[PDB]
């Protein structure tokens with residue numbers, strides 16, 4: 001079934017309806033399951049994913065459930081390429097949504113986007129599950145404007161060395177704390193650092209962080225103490241939240257439970 005029953009999905013029950021573009025593992029399509037339920041169909045480019053490892057991990061991911069996580073419905077592994085079937089998010093990735101200036105967002109909407117992501121991350125934190133590549137490009141927006149976190153943990157199965165190497169052209173340098181870039185020290189606190197950068201992306205309406213610097217320059221400067229400036233749309237209180245994520249000491253960074261409380265406190269002032 002689709003979130004029920006077997007999680008090997010019969011591709012005969014899928015109908016392809018629209019190209020959605022491409023992501024980390026290649027082509028993504030919009031389709032229907034048994035003619036009625038909307039799904040996203042990720043077809044996994046051969047050679048791009050450590051597939052046996054992912055399929056084992058997918059059993060763990062099937063047991064995660066939260067309103068603000070994109071739901072994994074199942075897999076189609078009896079053909080080439082394999083497919084991954086997930087919840088359909090009709091407004092696409094958050095980065096491109098933020099960049100569409102027609103939306104004319106209120107800051108109350110931007111803060112709600114932060115809350116949505118923070119709830120998803122607090123849940124993963126409570127399950128001791130790291131995201132490992134949190135960023136606006138890995139969040140999706142549904143037809144009601146709700147933001148959900150996608151592809152949690154999947155960087156562990158990416159085979160492209162340019163994304164795996166911390167000096168590769170595709171590694172998320174601009175979302176990484178100094179202890180990741182210098183020592184490969186991943187923890188819940190490296191997700192915290194990335195979440196702060198994500199809040200900055202939201203309040204900057206999708207600007208690239210540290211745009212005036214190359215990846216190498218960014219890595220050097222943030223380790224010395226350079227920090228992203230306050231976006232014009234972020235109040236001082238909102239900036240303090242995102243800024244707290246970038247402490248040079250990992251153990252001085254908040255948890256996602258603390259961040260959520262801080263975000264709700266600002267929201268409750270409305």
Ligand SMILES: CN1CCN([C@@H]2CCCN(c3cnc(C(N)=O)c(Nc4ccc(C5CCNCC5)cc4)n3)C2)C1=O
Pocket residue numbers: 020021022023024028040070086087088089090091092093094096137140
């Ligand atoms: C605007 N781009 C271009 C490419 N890309 C993404 C990047 C990440 C992987 N890929 C996914 C994954 N999963 C889903 C899901 N679970 O829905 C999904 N959905 C989706 C994607 C794009 C749209 C566009 C948005 C603007 N109006 C026309 C339609 C709509 C739904 N795309 C494609 C992306 O967002």
Ligand SMILES: [Cl-]
Pocket residue numbers: 203204230231232233
């Ligand atoms: Cl700005």
Ligand SMILES: [Pd+2]
Pocket residue numbers: none
């Ligand atoms: Pd062949």
